[PDB]
Amino acid sequence: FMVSLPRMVYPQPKVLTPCRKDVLVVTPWLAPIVWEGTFNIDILNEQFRLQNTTIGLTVFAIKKYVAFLKLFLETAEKHFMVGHRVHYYVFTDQPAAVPRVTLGTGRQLSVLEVRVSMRRMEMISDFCERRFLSEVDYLVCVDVDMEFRDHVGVEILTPLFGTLHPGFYGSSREAFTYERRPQSQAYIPKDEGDFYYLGGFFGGSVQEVQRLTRACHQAMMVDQANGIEAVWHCESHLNKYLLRHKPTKVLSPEYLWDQQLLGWPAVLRKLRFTAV
């Protein structure tokens, strides 16, 4: 079970004062949308540390993309789940090119050799299935050509989460780049859709992440057999899955931003994880 929190002194939440009035902070299925100002990280850290939470962070670094590992891992050390147990899983075709990065206590890295479009979904579902169940409580699946710039912590953890694509968070659903051909398993028509989620940042409990990756892998195989490739590949399938299986938290675009392409809008109080 879960033990009591200790006594804590913090500002009283005020019912007649919203945290943020400029953005939606809860979905219509009552999942929090995680923005700066919506969470007290001290309360959340207590809750998750009292469960001895271990977070797995997966990245694929193939061919030239191994060059991104050093900055990715060094900045993860500064910003990602600091204080909690972290297990990095680096999937690569070049185990010797993985940089030797100094890790904080309670943090470990495993290099897993591989070797295409389906490799990520396949590797996460039913190649590393048993290992992940034994080793971590949550999985966070991200792209490697990125850097952490600010806190990314236990506020994201939940059974299943997606992240709002920074190019589409203000867009009408008709403008979302979902797969629009009915012949694809990823098809979403013009009158459906909550959000446009990123392929590059999703996660959840190991069980829910394995369900998602298994479903996507199966859908991608069906499309391949039918001679169709979804417009945005695994991201299109991720969007179909999260439409039909609503995430239990949604991360705001603070969690995956491209400052060169999109600047630093007022609505973003922090830029936490960004394109290089």
What is the 3-class SS of 1-51, one letter each residue?
A: CCCCCCCCCCCCCCCCCCCCCCCCCECCCCCEEECCCCCCHHHHHHHHHCC
Method underlying the structure: X-ray
Amino acid in the structure at residue 7: R
Q: Any binding-site annotation on 151?
A: no
For the sheet with 85-92, list strands across it: 33-34, 249-251, 160-163, 201-205, 138-142, 54-61, 85-92, 107-113
Dist CA 273 CA 201 (whole Å): 10
Contact residues for 226 (Cβ-Cβ < 8 A; gap 6+): 183, 184
Q: What are the catalytic residues?
A: 235
- Placement of tokens 């048993």 in the chain: 130
Q: Any binding-site annotation on 202?
A: no
Resolution (A): 1.5
Asked if 129 and 112 touch (Cβ cutoff 8 Å), the reply is: no
Q: Any binding-site annotation on 235?
A: yes
Nearest of 154, 44, 134, 51 to residue 89 by alpha carbon: 134
Q: Any binding-site annotation on 137?
A: no
Q: Any binding-site annotation on 165?
A: yes
Strand partners, 160: 204
Dihedrals phi, psi of 33, to nearest 5 degrees? -105, 120
- CATH number of the domain located at residue range(s) 1-276 in this protein: 3.90.550.10
- In degrees, rounded to 5, the angle at the alpha carbon of residue 181 between the alpha carbons of residues 190 and 170 is 35
Strand-strand pairing, 273-275 and 146-148: antiparallel
Dist CA 234 CA 199 (whole Å): 7
- Placement of tokens 């050799």 in the chain: 113
Dist CA 206 CA 269 (whole Å): 30
Nearest of 162, 224, 222, 217 to residue 193 by alpha carbon: 162
Dihedrals phi, psi of 268, to nearest 5 degrees? -95, 100
Burial of residue 124 (CB within 10 Å: 0-12, 13-18, 19+) is buried
Q: Any binding-site annotation on 194?
A: no
Dist CA 219 CA 186 (whole Å): 7
